[PDB]
Structure formats: C-alpha cells, structure tokens
UniProtKB/Swiss-Prot annotation:
Belongs to the universal ribosomal protein uL5 family. It comes from Geobacillus stearothermophilus. The lineage of its organism: Bacteria, Bacillati, Bacillota, Bacilli, Bacillales. PROSITE patterns: RIBOSOMAL_L5 (PS00358). HAMAP family: Ribosomal_uL5_B. The gene is rplE. This is Large ribosomal subunit protein uL5.
C-alpha cells in the first residue's frame, strides 16, 4: 500500500491510540480529504488567470479542479454572488496520500527560507489550513511554463473532533511544524 497510509496505520494509529486513549480504532482521527485551493480574486476580469489556476491545480493535484464562486452578499462593486473567484480540487484516498506524502517530503522543504509550517493555522474544528506563498514549491510546476509565481491554500480535513487531535495526527504523519 501507499507509504504514507502504511505509516498512518502502523505507526500513527497506535501512537494516537496511546496519546488519546480512544475506545477503538474507529475513534482515531484520519485525514478525510485534502482541498487544494488557488484563489483568483479577479478571474472574472482576467479569464486567463483562472485558466492558469485550473491548469496549475491539475498539474499539482493530478486531478481536475472545479471553479469556486462568490457567495451571496450586499455590496461588492455591484454584481457579485456567483462570480468565479478561484479554483479548487479535493483529493481523497490513494491520490490524497500520494499528494500529502510529496507535500511533506518534497514540496514544503523547498519553500523559500523554510523554517517549518505553522502549528497555529487550524480552524477550531480539526482541520488544518496550509498557506502556500509560492506554488513553485511543487515539482509539477515549472516556473518557465507559468505566467507568474503565486500562492495557494491547502486545507487538510481530518475526522478529529479537535485541533489538538488533528495536530497530533499531522505531526505523527510527518507534517514539518515550526518548533
């Protein structure tokens, strides 16, 4: 099976069982999905920036993204709800583990003046948000084939009830948290 899923089952689960003393394996947190988002605030006025985001996400995630849109509202330069504002791709299963394994071992360390990732960016519901400054850290991206360096966000959704349990799950999986 996938290297990281094996580490999860053989090392992480028993470690979480010991760390939180769950009643059974069914209560142990797992990563459920990883949502890779590339905001293109404009996109409406710059169709090409959205197109680039869509292609780069396809390269980064090995899966086709979906366009994200603005939610209901009042003001926003008149006209707003429904306008494209970026693109996202949600990974599950084997592809999700492959992506995270590479993210942890290859991409994140390649970040400019890398000093580890934030231990604080959790949403209070057990999910981790990783703000990425430059999409260039992904080996699937080639600077010479992109219109420009840009950032993105990666949300790692877990089945943990709390940030504390999700953080331990991610640390045990190898997430290079700042220290």
């Amino acid at each position: 099976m996938n290297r990281l899923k094996e580490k999860y089952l053989n090392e992480v689960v028993p470690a979480l069982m010991s760390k939180f003393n769950y009643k059974s394996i069914m209560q142990v947190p797992k990563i459920e999905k990883i949502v890779i988002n590339m905001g293109v605030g404009d996109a409406v006025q710059n169709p090409k920036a959205l197109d680039s985001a869509v292609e780069e996400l396809t390269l980064i995630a090995g899966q086709r993204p979906v366009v994200t849109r603005a939610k209901k509202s009042i003001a926003g330069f008149r006209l707003r709800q429904g306008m494209p504002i970026g693109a996202k791709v949600t990974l599950r299963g084997e592809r999700m583990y492959e992506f995270l394994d590479k993210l942890i071992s290859v991409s994140l360390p390649r970040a400019r003046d890398f000093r580890g990732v934030s231990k604080k960016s959790f949403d209070g519901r057990g999910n981790y948000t990783l703000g990425i400054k430059e999409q260039l850290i992904f080996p699937e991206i080639d600077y010479d084939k992109v219109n420009k360096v840009r950032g993105m966000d990666i949300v790692i959704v877990t089945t943990a009830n709390t940030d504390e349990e999700a953080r331990e799950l991610l640390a045990l999986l190898g997430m290079p948290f700042q220290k």
